[PDB]
Amino acid sequence: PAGFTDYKVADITLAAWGRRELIIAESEMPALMGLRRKYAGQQPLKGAKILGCIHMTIQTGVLIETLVALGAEVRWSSCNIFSTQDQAAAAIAAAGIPVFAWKGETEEEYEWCIEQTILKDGQPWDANMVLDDGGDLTEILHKKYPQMLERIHGITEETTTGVHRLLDMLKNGTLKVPAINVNDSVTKSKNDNKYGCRHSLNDAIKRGTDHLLSGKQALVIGYGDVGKGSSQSLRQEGMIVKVAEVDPICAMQACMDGFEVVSPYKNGINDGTEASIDAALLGKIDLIVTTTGNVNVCDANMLKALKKRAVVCNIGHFDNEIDTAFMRKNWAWEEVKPQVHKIHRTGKDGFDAHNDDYLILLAEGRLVNLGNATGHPSRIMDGSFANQVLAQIHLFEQKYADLPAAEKAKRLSVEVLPKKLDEEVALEMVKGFGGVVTQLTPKQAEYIGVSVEGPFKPDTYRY
Amino acid sequence: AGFTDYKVADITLAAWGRRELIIAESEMPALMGLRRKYAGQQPLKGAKILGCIHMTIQTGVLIETLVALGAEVRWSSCNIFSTQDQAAAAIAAAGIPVFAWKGETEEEYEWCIEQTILKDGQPWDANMVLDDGGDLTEILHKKYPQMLERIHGITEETTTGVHRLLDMLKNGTLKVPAINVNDSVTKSKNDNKYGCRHSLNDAIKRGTDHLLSGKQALVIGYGDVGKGSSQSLRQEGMIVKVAEVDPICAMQACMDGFEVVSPYKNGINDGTEASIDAALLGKIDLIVTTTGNVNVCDANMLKALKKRAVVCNIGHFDNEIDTAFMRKNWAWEEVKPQVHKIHRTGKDGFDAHNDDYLILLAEGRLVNLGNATGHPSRIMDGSFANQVLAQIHLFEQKYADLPAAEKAKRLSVEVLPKKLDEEVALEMVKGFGGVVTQLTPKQAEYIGVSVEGPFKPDTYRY
Amino acid sequence: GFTDYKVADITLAAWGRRELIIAESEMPALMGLRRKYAGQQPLKGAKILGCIHMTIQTGVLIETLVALGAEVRWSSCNIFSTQDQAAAAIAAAGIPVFAWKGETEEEYEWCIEQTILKDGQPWDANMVLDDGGDLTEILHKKYPQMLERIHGITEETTTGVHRLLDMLKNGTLKVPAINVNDSVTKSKNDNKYGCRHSLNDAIKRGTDHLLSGKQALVIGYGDVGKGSSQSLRQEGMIVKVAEVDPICAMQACMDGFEVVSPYKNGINDGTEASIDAALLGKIDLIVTTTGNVNVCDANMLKALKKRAVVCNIGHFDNEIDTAFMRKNWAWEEVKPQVHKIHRTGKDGFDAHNDDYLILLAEGRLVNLGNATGHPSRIMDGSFANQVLAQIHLFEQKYADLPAAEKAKRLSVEVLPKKLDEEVALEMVKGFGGVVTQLTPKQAEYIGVSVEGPFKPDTYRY
Amino acid sequence: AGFTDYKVADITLAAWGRRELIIAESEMPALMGLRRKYAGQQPLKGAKILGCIHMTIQTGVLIETLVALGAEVRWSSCNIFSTQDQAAAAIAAAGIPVFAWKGETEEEYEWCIEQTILKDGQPWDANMVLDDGGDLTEILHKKYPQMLERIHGITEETTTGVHRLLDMLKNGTLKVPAINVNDSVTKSKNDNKYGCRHSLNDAIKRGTDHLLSGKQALVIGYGDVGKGSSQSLRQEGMIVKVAEVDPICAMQACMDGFEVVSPYKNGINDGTEASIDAALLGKIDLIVTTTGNVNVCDANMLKALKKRAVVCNIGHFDNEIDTAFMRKNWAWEEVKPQVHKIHRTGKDGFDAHNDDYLILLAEGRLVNLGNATGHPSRIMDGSFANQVLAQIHLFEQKYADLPAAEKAKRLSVEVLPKKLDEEVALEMVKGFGGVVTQLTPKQAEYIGVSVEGPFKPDTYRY
Numbered sequence A: 001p002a003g004f005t006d007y008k009v010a011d012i013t014l015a016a017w018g019r020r021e022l023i024i025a026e027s028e029m030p031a032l033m034g035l036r037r038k039y040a041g042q043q044p045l046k047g048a049k050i051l052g053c054i055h056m057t058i059q060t061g062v063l064i065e066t067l068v069a070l071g072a073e074v075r076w077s078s079c080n081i082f083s084t085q086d087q088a089a090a091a092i093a094a095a096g097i098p099v100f101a102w103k104g105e106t107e108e109e110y111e112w113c114i115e116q117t118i119l120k121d122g123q124p125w126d127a128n129m130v131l132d133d134g135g136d137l138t139e140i141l142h143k144k145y146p147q148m149l150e151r152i153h154g155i156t157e158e159t160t161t162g163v164h165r166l167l168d169m170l171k172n173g174t175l176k177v178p179a180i181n182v183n184d185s186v187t188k189s190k191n192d193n194k195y196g197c198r199h200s201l202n203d204a205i206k207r208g209t210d211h212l213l214s215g216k217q218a219l220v221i222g223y224g225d226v227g228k229g230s231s232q233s234l235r236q237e238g239m240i241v242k243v244a245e246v247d248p249i250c251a252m253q254a255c256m257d258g259f260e261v262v263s264p265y266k267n268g269i270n271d272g273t274e275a276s277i278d279a280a281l282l283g284k285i286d287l288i289v290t291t292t293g294n295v296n297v298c299d300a301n302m303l304k305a306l307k308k309r310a311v312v313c314n315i316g317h318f319d320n321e322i323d324t325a326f327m328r329k330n331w332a333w334e335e336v337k338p339q340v341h342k343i344h345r346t347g348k349d350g351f352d353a354h355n356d357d358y359l360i361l362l363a364e365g366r367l368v369n370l371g372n373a374t375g376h377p378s379r380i381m382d383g384s385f386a387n388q389v390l391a392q393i394h395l396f397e398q399k400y401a402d403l404p405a406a407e408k409a410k411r412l413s414v415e416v417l418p419k420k421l422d423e424e425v426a427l428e429m430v431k432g433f434g435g436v437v438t439q440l441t442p443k444q445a446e447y448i449g450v451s452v453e454g455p456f457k458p459d460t461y462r463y
Numbered sequence B, D: 001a002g003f004t005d006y007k008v009a010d011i012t013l014a015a016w017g018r019r020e021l022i023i024a025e026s027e028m029p030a031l032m033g034l035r036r037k038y039a040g041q042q043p044l045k046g047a048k049i050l051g052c053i054h055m056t057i058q059t060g061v062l063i064e065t066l067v068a069l070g071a072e073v074r075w076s077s078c079n080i081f082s083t084q085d086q087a088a089a090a091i092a093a094a095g096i097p098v099f100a101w102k103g104e105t106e107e108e109y110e111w112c113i114e115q116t117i118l119k120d121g122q123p124w125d126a127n128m129v130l131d132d133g134g135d136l137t138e139i140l141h142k143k144y145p146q147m148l149e150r151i152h153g154i155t156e157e158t159t160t161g162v163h164r165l166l167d168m169l170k171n172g173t174l175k176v177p178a179i180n181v182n183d184s185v186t187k188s189k190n191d192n193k194y195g196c197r198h199s200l201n202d203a204i205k206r207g208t209d210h211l212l213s214g215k216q217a218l219v220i221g222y223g224d225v226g227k228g229s230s231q232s233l234r235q236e237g238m239i240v241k242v243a244e245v246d247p248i249c250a251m252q253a254c255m256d257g258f259e260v261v262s263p264y265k266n267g268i269n270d271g272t273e274a275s276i277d278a279a280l281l282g283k284i285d286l287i288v289t290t291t292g293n294v295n296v297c298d299a300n301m302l303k304a305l306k307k308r309a310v311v312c313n314i315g316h317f318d319n320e321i322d323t324a325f326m327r328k329n330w331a332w333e334e335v336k337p338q339v340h341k342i343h344r345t346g347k348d349g350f351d352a353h354n355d356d357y358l359i360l361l362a363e364g365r366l367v368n369l370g371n372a373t374g375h376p377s378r379i380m381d382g383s384f385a386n387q388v389l390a391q392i393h394l395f396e397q398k399y400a401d402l403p404a405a406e407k408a409k410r411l412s413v414e415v416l417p418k419k420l421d422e423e424v425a426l427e428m429v430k431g432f433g434g435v436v437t438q439l440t441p442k443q444a445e446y447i448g449v450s451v452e453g454p455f456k457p458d459t460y461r462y
Numbered sequence C: 001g002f003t004d005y006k007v008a009d010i011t012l013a014a015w016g017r018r019e020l021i022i023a024e025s026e027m028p029a030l031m032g033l034r035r036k037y038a039g040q041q042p043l044k045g046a047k048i049l050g051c052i053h054m055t056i057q058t059g060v061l062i063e064t065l066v067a068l069g070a071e072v073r074w075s076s077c078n079i080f081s082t083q084d085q086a087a088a089a090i091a092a093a094g095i096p097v098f099a100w101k102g103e104t105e106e107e108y109e110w111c112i113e114q115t116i117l118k119d120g121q122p123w124d125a126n127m128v129l130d131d132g133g134d135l136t137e138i139l140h141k142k143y144p145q146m147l148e149r150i151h152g153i154t155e156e157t158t159t160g161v162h163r164l165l166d167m168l169k170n171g172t173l174k175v176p177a178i179n180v181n182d183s184v185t186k187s188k189n190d191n192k193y194g195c196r197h198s199l200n201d202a203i204k205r206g207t208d209h210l211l212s213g214k215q216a217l218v219i220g221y222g223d224v225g226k227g228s229s230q231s232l233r234q235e236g237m238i239v240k241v242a243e244v245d246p247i248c249a250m251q252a253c254m255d256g257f258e259v260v261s262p263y264k265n266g267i268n269d270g271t272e273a274s275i276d277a278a279l280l281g282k283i284d285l286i287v288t289t290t291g292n293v294n295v296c297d298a299n300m301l302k303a304l305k306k307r308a309v310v311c312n313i314g315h316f317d318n319e320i321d322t323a324f325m326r327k328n329w330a331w332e333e334v335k336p337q338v339h340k341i342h343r344t345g346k347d348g349f350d351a352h353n354d355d356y357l358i359l360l361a362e363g364r365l366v367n368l369g370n371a372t373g374h375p376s377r378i379m380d381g382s383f384a385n386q387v388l389a390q391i392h393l394f395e396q397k398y399a400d401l402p403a404a405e406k407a408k409r410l411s412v413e414v415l416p417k418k419l420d421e422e423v424a425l426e427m428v429k430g431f432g433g434v435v436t437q438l439t440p441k442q443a444e445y446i447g448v449s450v451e452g453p454f455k456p457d458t459y460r461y
């Protein structure tokens, strides 16, 4: 529109291209678009003012415009420095939506962008809803703008790491507003986290290095939802995949799924010494992928022992899964192309351009699927963002900020969406594939003790 | 010396069974680690356990583990076709009352169960129940409620059995507390899924020796058993289509690379032949039911199936397939035990060279156990370690010695704590030679767990 | 009163007949050959010496040959591969057959002799069907005069073809032969997909071991090694592959397998020191697939992880040094064709000894020894090639040719690709597949007839 | 600097290309092993090679291996979309004449091949040819047959080019001997299959970022490229159907777990819309042509495909798909380079929010090279080690200098000896850390081979 400058993107001329890709993505997101069409007439989010912090991809564009189509105002930023698709951010800004995001931000630019959503015209925006991915915006609000939380009705957190931070604040009494855990919807956790990484991990590695994967040796650290999806991403390409875990139930699943379970440390004991590193094992690894959400699971001693020219990447939320700090202090970095670096283990000052003793680090340790590719595909993010919309509507309509203190105390929690809504999202996803769900006969529904409409499983069911 | 309190097919198979039990013990490290750890403590001394579960080699290692920990048992199988006779023989030969053989009649099945409940014509002084499917539990509540006054708890193996317990509980008709063994992760996401992955194609190959690559399969259900069964067939190279009523499970099937379809047009089962997607069913070479529901492969579906298609059921009960319709209308030709050609040409007789027949396996009973040996020992290790832990817990709680006011406060259906689930998993991983990494204190602090676990909140779905 | 046979138990015939009727519905290419050649009786006057695993599938092959006019006399080419109900049904039909499951070496030799001799004198045989070359060898060495009446040999398997080619090179082969093995609808169907189906099948029936999560070493990656490797990997085994052929080793790499050697740096010097004891100490299962000699040797057997399974799916048992195990280690029979080999010695064994290996079928081909071999729908391809090869060599009548015309025909050849394609189409139709027909322009564009053959003879598929 | 005998998109991308060249060298052990082995001998001293093959990073390593062995070259790409611009830049910057860029026109493509043939308006004194698809070979035979008098041979990369050579050989129009590089096992059974397995789903993801799991694909053809393409999609969770005209290849698709279908009712392509299986084609989300044939995805098939289906080709030439019909009848909307929405609602104009469109990748050109980067270095290593050995053998044979009677005995289309195929394979295996076992003397004697090989008869199909 004419006069709109309340944004900061890399190249506004990319908007036409981004619009072409948003129009394709709408065709790939039936659950999310079905909610857009379902709630359009009602406008369940009229009056919502949403602070959003999540990877500014084409898929997030569809989510953003869905929220706007339901009545909300939003101010947006990405939750990672390398995850933004610049044509997505351009198309959103061209639509008149405040978005501060580009691919390749510095740490300072990243913090600047979140603050640009928090502040409008040099004063705290009168926001009343928060959509977060990783909890960085939630942390800035609680630590730097706590008075704004007196007007916010709730937070809808996208990812595992963010939910852990919320539960930590709830346990310490420091969480100021209720939240919905979007991550643990089955149409999110067991779809986004697992199948998303199956699609996008080997995608990112091929775009970054164009390395053949078949026949090579991989070590996946972690076998949660992301580790499961990451392991399959590599194994389906023909890699020989070994899996590390601290959780023996997950380790049991890796074994039964056909993976050898190993540890980087002798007998799994990480005493911090070089002698504890299984140097024979790590000397045969061509690719190491961290998937834990933990800290320093690919440490300095492991990086020193890795086979020459191995690829190192992280698909967990934060870069501290790999001890990149050590590599910056001790090893020379040679940039191949954006988000692909050769780390030369021959010393800090300078490198031989034909040196063979280097490692290849992708996205400088940041989420590799979004950093070196485009993250999850639209048809997978459909489930996650459908949940986001439902979670926004529910928390906004509850109107926590307006309740009396006694009613607040009953509502101050971290909850998940009801299974029935989970099932309804899954149903639209299945129809997108052309799948046909069978309806129970009344006699059958009575036999197993469920309604014909569902829910079909008890809340304890793990799928 | 003069042990006669048993009924098996052939006691002379005992030596063979002992040889296979010794092998199975090396495949079951978690169960044997329990046997080693608790042998001296004798935590089941005084326990008198009525056991009703498939009398396989694997159940034999379970039985002898309970006996090793101090228990007395009386045992029957929970399916007429699932017993391995050499395993029943080795257990009888060791002086353990067992009433089980492959190929029981329905009457013999009920009689075997009663032989565990009655000793010398009187009710045995049982105080513990181990059940698989809830048949023994039902007979106890229905025909012997006085025995339940002395029983400290039930440990239920399987999905169908847990559902029947939860129905009794909401109806106020459950008399003793139960432990839901099924919903240990080292049971449900191990036994139910991976076990059927191993044993479904196994049983189909033993029954028919049919090539599976390139042929078309329809799996009804995509719960844990349906997941495992679908993989059992897809890894053989079948083109597998999946049916579901649960849209979340259907979503998983699509993402796992399967076409999700319905036997009925637009998914609507109106009971008429016109509802049958006859085009789809006419292309199916193999159908497998996995639901725990009733009549999910109904008469109209059986009428529409491709000639010479194979029909089998791997859920707990045979009413998933309308076998009664087939007994009533079609002529049965036995190829060999637990393999029948069912001739759709009529009831009275059949032409030996008729081409319009179906092949039914295990007369619609659990096919992995009926036509093969069920799950392998190293998978049943997880399930049966959980059973031993469940039996110790309920026996040590001594529910039946509580006043009526306290019984009411502890009458429930619970699962084992996650810490025990993890410890069973550790011994399973070690059995494969896997090495679990230990968290550093700062790593445990960072994700908010103890170094030793539990590593996941109770909400985690794995 | 037919008595010209010997089987385990003739009362199994009705059961075998029931399974033959099912097998026919799984073998459309073979049954199609019955319908196509029935009226013409192209093997009328043929008298076939047959030596191949007496399975239900072989039963349908036998009766297909008879339906086309032939008389046969049958034995099995392995001591453990007979299905007794199949042999029973063949006998009951009035067909001379000498085969049962669990023959001794002596009885095996006696069974071949019974097919060769009728009433104490050599049968007037004129055709040979063989699987592995044992019948071929006995005729060439013990009854060379019968070969003057025989029009040809149709040899099933890689080991047999290799023996034939040595005799051809050495000028000792008497009659022409058809390499049935190297039809694509045989080698790239039977040897590969067949073992994919039947290797894990046999391991499950013998041991009921979980395979998922365990470590396997497959020795060899030819057609059998390729299918065997896939049989285990699809169950979830972590499979390592050994090879002497770098091209085959390259395929294993690209297929997602780690390529390893039992010997350090791949050099086998015959000493325990050459053994990669750390590799072997992790292996839960080893399978030999080479057709070579002693590829699972004594030093490898000493070094295997306790309680590993050892088995062979090549044609002969000498792939595994079972001789060494019979000499030094105590054998405990678990059940027929399943033995625990106690590495503690030969002076008895502790029934609870933990240091043993499990050997299947005493090293004989394990898919047939501990299960039922390949499924009917796979053997359909192989045995359609066998019938066509029988007709091709029989209609040529080499034994009646003038001497000055025999040299042109004394060879070992494969069937023409047109026959290979004809068998393949019938298999594809068995699966409900629909083959696209080229338009004339498309056929012109790629330079083939619309009728085929569709590939040059150089093509490898 | 001073040197202007090239044309690339952007010479300033050279340092980037050089960085990726250095990485590729570490991924190409067989190609670099020939570089080291023959560097001292200079076996291509005097060779002047015209090269026409996709100007990628992998081709760069091939080009610099030839130069390192003493050759001079003049290079162009064999496809308008397959060049990597940073690779062409690094080559031109190394002083090597190269005429290639991503996104040429058909005129510029021909012009590039002409600029290698001609130096300063006159024909270069070439004596060797390296070709991929036969376009350069065709241009020499038709338009510069005088240059062939002094050329010692052709090394053809791909199946389509070998076919064109064998036609010329049969007709007697082939002027110089050729080596079929394609049919080395370390080429056909590595490049053609495994390469497409890697790069087909890679290209589609880069073009569309479409989820592939759970969607329906139809692969036209099941040769080596079809086999790899089918696996590329199946391994991602697609439901893959396979079409074929060759029953043997069709039998392989069945046994590999694929449903084999024809786009035509009963497989009869009579040229009418009635012959189209509209039901089948209405369910397909992605079609991929792999045939090397013409019009195997015709106009009626395109009219019948599901809305928003993806259409691409990974055969050598774009005429596998009838893109001519689409240019004449439908409106093309460019999403981004090499990605077009083809709106089936008319020829002139389109609604930006129209839903009846197909997505065509690379305008029908080879999708793996057009929308991604083709095969990975470690795979092209095998193909390009064969190319070097092939060039060495034909250049040293010096055909163009041989007596007429010798010319006649050597004018053929031949493959490399199996011993060299094995030697290439061995270096690829060592590149993976694989360990090849050495036969003992007795074992080699038992199977009738040298301990050094070759290990298989020439008839072996692997």
Ligand SMILES: NC(=O)c1ccc[n+]([C@@H]2O[C@H](COP(=O)([O-])OP(=O)(O)OC[C@H]3O[C@@H](n4cnc5c(N)ncnc54)[C@H](O)[C@@H]3O)[C@@H](O)[C@H]2O)c1
Residues within 6 Å of the ligand: A159, A160, A161, A162, A192, A193, A196, A197, A221, A222, A223, A224, A225, A226, A227, A244, A245, A246, A247, A250, A291, A292, A293, A294, A297, A315, A316, A317, A318, A367, A368, A369, A370, A375, A376, B437, B439, B443, B455
């Ligand atoms: N990049 C993406 O597209 C994407 C998508 C979803 C989530 N995520 C992020 O990925 C991370 C993992 O998420 P998740 O859903 O898989 O969580 P999860 O809890 O399901 O899995 C993490 C696993 O790591 C294991 N682990 C922890 N410390 C370990 C160590 N030192 N060594 C080995 N294993 C260890 C734990 O046992 C656990 O099973 C989170 O930070 C989440 O926010 C990323």
Ligand SMILES: NC(=O)c1ccc[n+]([C@@H]2O[C@H](COP(=O)([O-])OP(=O)(O)OC[C@H]3O[C@@H](n4cnc5c(N)ncnc54)[C@H](O)[C@@H]3O)[C@@H](O)[C@H]2O)c1
Residues within 6 Å of the ligand: A438, A440, A444, A456, B158, B159, B160, B161, B191, B192, B195, B196, B220, B221, B222, B223, B224, B225, B226, B243, B244, B245, B246, B249, B290, B291, B292, B293, B296, B314, B315, B316, B317, B366, B367, B368, B369, B374, B375
């Ligand atoms: N044979 C074995 O070894 C074995 C092992 C474990 C459990 N079981 C039995 O198998 C059954 C299933 O066990 P589970 O743990 O997988 O249960 P589950 O609840 O996880 O799965 C059953 C599935 O069937 C689906 N379903 C229900 N009705 C349906 C219908 N009409 N059509 C299609 N799908 C339908 C449900 O939505 C559900 O996902 C139970 O009877 C259980 O006792 C057998």
Ligand SMILES: NC(=O)c1ccc[n+]([C@@H]2O[C@H](COP(=O)([O-])OP(=O)(O)OC[C@H]3O[C@@H](n4cnc5c(N)ncnc54)[C@H](O)[C@@H]3O)[C@@H](O)[C@H]2O)c1
Residues within 6 Å of the ligand: C157, C158, C159, C160, C190, C191, C194, C195, C219, C220, C221, C222, C223, C224, C225, C242, C243, C244, C245, C248, C289, C290, C291, C292, C295, C313, C314, C315, C316, C365, C366, C367, C368, C373, C374, D437, D439, D443, D455
């Ligand atoms: N059991 C069955 O159902 C069945 C079916 C077909 C063939 N076979 C038999 O299996 C054997 C193999 O047949 P094939 O078609 O695979 O032959 P093949 O030539 O295609 O493969 C054998 C492979 O073994 C490799 N090899 C040889 N010695 C080796 C060693 N010491 N270490 C490692 N690798 C070694 C060779 O390089 C070759 O690639 C033959 O004896 C054949 O008759 C058995």
Ligand SMILES: NC(=O)c1ccc[n+]([C@@H]2O[C@H](COP(=O)([O-])OP(=O)(O)OC[C@H]3O[C@@H](n4cnc5c(N)ncnc54)[C@H](O)[C@@H]3O)[C@@H](O)[C@H]2O)c1
Residues within 6 Å of the ligand: C436, C438, C442, C454, D158, D159, D160, D161, D191, D192, D195, D196, D220, D221, D222, D223, D224, D225, D226, D243, D244, D245, D246, D249, D290, D291, D292, D293, D296, D314, D315, D316, D317, D366, D367, D368, D369, D374, D375
């Ligand atoms: N893009 C790449 O990276 C790449 C790599 C190698 C080869 N190629 C090219 O791909 C093409 C195929 O090469 P190839 O080695 O697989 O050849 P191939 O001969 O091995 O395979 C082609 C197959 O197509 C089948 N076919 C022909 N017409 C058909 C039709 N109308 N319908 C269905 N199937 C039909 C044939 O029967 C044959 O099996 C050639 O043009 C080749 O140059 C591309």
Ligand SMILES: Nc1ncnc2[nH]cnc12
Residues within 6 Å of the ligand: A054, A055, A056, A057, A058, A059, A060, A196, A370, A374, A375, A376, A377, A381
């Ligand atoms: N494409 C994507 N868009 C937004 N959030 C994501 N998380 C993972 N992939 C994503």
Ligand SMILES: Nc1ncnc2[nH]cnc12
Residues within 6 Å of the ligand: B053, B054, B055, B056, B058, B059, B195, B369, B373, B374, B375, B376, B380
């Ligand atoms: N082998 C087995 N033994 C006992 N119960 C089982 N359930 C499934 N397989 C079993």
Ligand SMILES: [K+]
Residues within 6 Å of the ligand: A057, A059, A374, A375, A376, A377, A378, D209
């Ligand atoms: K994306």
Ligand SMILES: [K+]
Residues within 6 Å of the ligand: B056, B058, B373, B374, B375, B376, B377, C208
């Ligand atoms: K079992």
Ligand SMILES: [K+]
Residues within 6 Å of the ligand: B209, C055, C057, C372, C373, C374, C375, C376
């Ligand atoms: K069989």
Ligand SMILES: [K+]
Residues within 6 Å of the ligand: A210, D056, D058, D373, D374, D375, D376, D377
């Ligand atoms: K590349």
